Structure 1
Amino acid sequence: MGSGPIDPKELLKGLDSFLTRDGEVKSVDGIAKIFSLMKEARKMVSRCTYLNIILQTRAPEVLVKFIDVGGYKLLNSWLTYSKTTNNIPLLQQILLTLQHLPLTVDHLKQNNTAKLVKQLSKSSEDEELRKLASVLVSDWMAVIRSQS
């Protein structure tokens, strides 16, 4: 009650019906609700709370539906944002959520995230993001070379 600190729990507890005890989304349309609050989450802390939910989500359909509603490209928008603003642990959160959802060869050849993240994996300052990048790049080149 009131407003002095930033309370992101108000958004997810008012919508607690679509959340679990674990913290994931119990129903695949709830993922579209999380995305709906996420795309307009005014602060870094609030939008990062939704990323944690995409990490908790164990279902294949919920992660694929997050991609389907344009969640993967929301991450691609914030990917360039967090790099230019030097938001290193925020960019990390976006990278580990990016690789947590099944980012297929299709998505790779549409958004071309592989060339962007390659610069981090090459010789960045951010050792955390660089090694994390080198993991997902090796995974992405694996699925690419197996297809074409």
Structure 2
Amino acid sequence: SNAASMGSGPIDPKELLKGLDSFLNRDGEVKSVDGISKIFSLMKEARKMVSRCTYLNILLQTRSPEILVKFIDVGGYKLLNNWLTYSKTTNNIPLLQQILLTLQHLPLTVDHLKQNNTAKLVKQLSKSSEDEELRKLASVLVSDWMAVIRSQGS
């Protein structure tokens, strides 16, 4: 879509999150494909932990696959991968686990796993996450991804 600067005074991060409702359906999931483009651009700047957790949920409740592929296209996958290793340093159980659920929720391919080492990062979590649910979730994601990586290699 077209873009322009449209500079203005600062906007509340509450108001930025509130502005995402405009992209949802009555049923609660993102219905506009370009809406996710803006959701992702704001996710880059989601400095607050609660804000990140909220963004993860918005993607998770978005069962619609057309939205999820576009989230990956804009590089949302790359951002989830960044959030994963970033949250590992703070050992934030709910953030970490919810990030992993978002990875499993979107359609994945071996290329994304190898290029950003994501599979190697979650491997550490499968053994080092203190919370039993988190290490369980991470272990499922590892085993699932190993099936994909072993299906196409060289």
TM-score (norm 1): 0.86
User: Secondary structure of 2:150's match?
Assistant: helix
Equivalent in 24, 28, 32 of residue 27 of structure 1: 32
* Residues 14-35 of structure 1: CA deviation (Å, up to 9, x unaligned): 3433112232111111111111
Identify, as 1 or 2, the structure richer in helix.
1
User: Secondary structure of 2:149's match?
Assistant: helix
TM-aligned CA distance change 1:47 to 1:2, over 3 Å: farther
Partners of 1:134 and 1:2 in 2: CA distance: 45
**Unaligned stretches of 5+ residues in structure 1:** none
Equivalent in 61, 67, 71 of residue 62 of structure 1: 67
Q: Could you tell me whether the CA contact under 8 Å between 1:31 and 1:65 is conserved in 2?
A: yes
TM-aligned CA distance change 1:115 to 1:57, over 3 Å: same
* Residues 81-137 of structure 1: CA deviation (Å, up to 9, x unaligned): 111112121111111111111121110111111111112213531211211011111
Q: Could you tell me whether the CA contact under 8 Å between 1:35 and 1:66 is conserved in 2?
A: yes
TM-aligned CA distance change 1:125 to 1:20, over 3 Å: same
After superposing the two structures, state which structure 1 stretch, 71-80 or 4-13, moved more.
Answer: 4-13
Q: Could you tell me whether the CA contact under 8 Å between 2:62 and 2:68 is conserved in 1?
A: yes
TM-aligned CA distance change 1:6 to 1:91, over 3 Å: farther
Q: Could you tell me whether the CA contact under 8 Å between 2:69 and 2:107 is conserved in 1?
A: yes
Equivalent in 12, 16, 19 of residue 17 of structure 2: 12
Partners of 2:36 and 2:95 in 1: CA distance: 20
TM-aligned CA distance change 1:5 to 1:22, over 3 Å: farther
* Residues 29-63 of structure 1: CA deviation (Å, up to 9, x unaligned): 11111112211123111221111110011222211
TM-score (norm 2): 0.83
Shift of 1:7: 8.2
2:94 matched to which residue of 1?
A: 89
Q: Could you tell me whether the CA contact under 8 Å between 2:23 and 2:32 is conserved in 1?
A: yes
Partners of 2:47 and 2:120 in 1: CA distance: 28
**Unaligned stretches of 5+ residues in structure 2:** 1-5
Q: Could you tell me whether the CA contact under 8 Å between 1:76 and 1:111 is conserved in 2?
A: yes
2:109 matched to which residue of 1?
A: 104
